[PDB]
Curated annotation (Swiss-Prot):
GO terms for molecular function: chromatin binding; lysine-acetylated histone binding. It is linked to A chromosomal aberration involving MLLT1 is associated with acute leukemias. Translocation t(11;19)(q23;p13.3) with KMT2A/MLL1. The result is a rogue activator protein. Its main location: nucleus. The chain holds residues 5 to 143 of 559 of the full protein. GO terms for biological process: positive regulation of DNA-templated transcription. This is Protein ENL. GO terms for cellular component: cytosol; fibrillar center; nucleoplasm; transcription elongation factor complex. The YEATS domain specifically recognizes and binds acylated histones, with a preference for histones that are crotonylated. Residues 52-54, 74-76 are annotated as: Acylated histone binding. Keywords: Acetylation, Activator, Chromosomal rearrangement, Isopeptide bond, Nucleus, Phosphoprotein, Proto-oncogene, Transcription, Transcription regulation, Ubl conjugation. It is found in: Nucleus. Component of the super elongation complex (SEC), at least composed of EAF1, EAF2, CDK9, MLLT3/AF9, AFF (AFF1 or AFF4), the P-TEFb complex and ELL (ELL, ELL2 or ELL3). Interacts with ALKBH4. Component of a SWI/SNF-like EBAFb complex, at least composed of SMARCA4/BRG1/BAF190A, SMARCB1/BAF47/SNF5, ACTL6A/BAF53A, SMARCE1/BAF57, SMARCD1/BAF60A, SMARCD2/BAF60B, SMARCC1/BAF155, SMARCC2/BAF170, ARID1B/BAF250B, MLLT1/ENL and actin. Transmembrane segments: none annotated.
Length: 142
């Protein structure tokens, strides 16, 4: 059989009225979460957010929900996001290339923004133990 589950990747960003002592101009948050009333913790081991090299501890890990990183900084960047599964067979993780953008190139000028990216994952022939976790999370058998 085939089991599909859904992830939502997203972020929010806020232009600061005044920059931090550090000069940070934006506050931002990036997340991985399930659709409403779906508990992805059943099948997600951890979520690794790979921040820009300039960040201290750029490898940010959440082993439990919420799977998110709140930060402040100077600029947007491309953020690899690994979602590791509670799975003993391949694949044990999926990697997303997440566009963490902090403005719209002043066209138009915004002082905040939100983005959501809905992702479907398809697991062929999961083990009994991993099927239970996927379906327990609200996954659909196909
Ligand atoms: C292309 C590019 C993109 C982002 C940054 C950036 O925001 N870097 C940055 C560098 C150091 C930072 N430190 C923080 C603050 N956190 C607070 C929580 C504890 C660790 C430090 N945010 C930081 C943000 C720099 C470049 I060049």
């Amino acid at each position: 059989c085939t089991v599909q589950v859904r992830l939502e990747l997203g972020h929010r960003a806020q232009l600061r009225k005044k920059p931090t002592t550090e000069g940070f101009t934006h506050d931002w948050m990036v997340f991985v979460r399930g659709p409403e009333q779906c508990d992805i913790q059943h099948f997600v081991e951890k979520v690794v957010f790979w921040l820009h090299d300039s960040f201290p501890k750029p490898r940010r890990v959440c082993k439990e929900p919420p799977y998110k990183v709140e930060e402040s900084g100077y600029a947007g960047f491309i953020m690899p996001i690994e979602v590791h599964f509670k799975n003993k067979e391949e694949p044990r993780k999926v990697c997303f290339t997440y566009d963490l953008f902090l403005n719209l190139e002043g066209n138009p000028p915004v002082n905040h923004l939100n983005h959501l990216r809905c992702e479907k994952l398809t697991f062929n022939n999961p083990t009994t133990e991993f099927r239970y976790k996927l379906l327990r999370a609200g996954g659909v058998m196909v």
